[PDB]
Design a protein around this ligand. Structure first.
Ligand SMILES: Nc1nc2ccc(O)cc2s1
Lengths: 109, 109
């Protein structure tokens, strides 16, 4: 049993199955429209999204890390920010793509 | 030369060189004692730390993602939490190791 953070979503084991329903609560992810949720790393523009995901070294190097204990369990918390390069020729498209998936679930029928 | 989020710290390119000095401010990292800062992914217990880092799929599946536009540019924000396995026989050691590195910088120059 690989832990949740090591899972990879695909068409046969999708974002909802691996990582739960999209939503606004603290423990929920909010990222992905219906196409990305159904397809995971098979999504047509997945590489353009993954360019922004951190390496293990960067995850622990760039982030503010903490530990919290709640009734549900013991949690390693993380927060940070990643600058988009507005000198990148593909900047405008990167922004459009990220905004299409952030909080997409709010307009799901 | 690589974007910050794709860098890999090592003895040749250490945590300070790759990710900046440890400290408390936003986008500043707070994780690592003197030994980890110097060695990065060559640190003896690096695998026991990296087991908690997310895959690219998990990062975008589990996290709360946002986009903050400020005078310095456009920033992709992330926040989330990784649950430790309370039934793992090494749970107690995992807690000790993470706590050893969180805010370690407060105790040395
Ligand atoms: N509702 C949630 N369950 C889990 C389980 C494991 C994990 O690492 C994060 C979460 S958020």
């Amino acid at each position: 049993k690989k832990p949740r953070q090591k899972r990879t979503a695909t068409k046969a084991y999708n974002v909802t199955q691996a990582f739960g329903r999209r939503g606004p609560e603290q423990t929920q992810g909010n990222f992905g429209d219906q196409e990305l949720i159904r397809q995971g790393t098979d999504y047509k523009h997945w590489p353009q999204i993954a360019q922004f995901a951190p390496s293990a070294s960067a995850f622990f190097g760039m982030s503010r890390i903490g530990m919290e204990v709640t009734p549900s369990g013991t949690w390693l918390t993380y927060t940070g920010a990643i600058k988009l390069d507005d000198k990148d020729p593909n900047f405008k498209d990167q922004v459009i793509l990220l905004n299409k998936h952030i909080d997409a679930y709010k307009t799901f029928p």
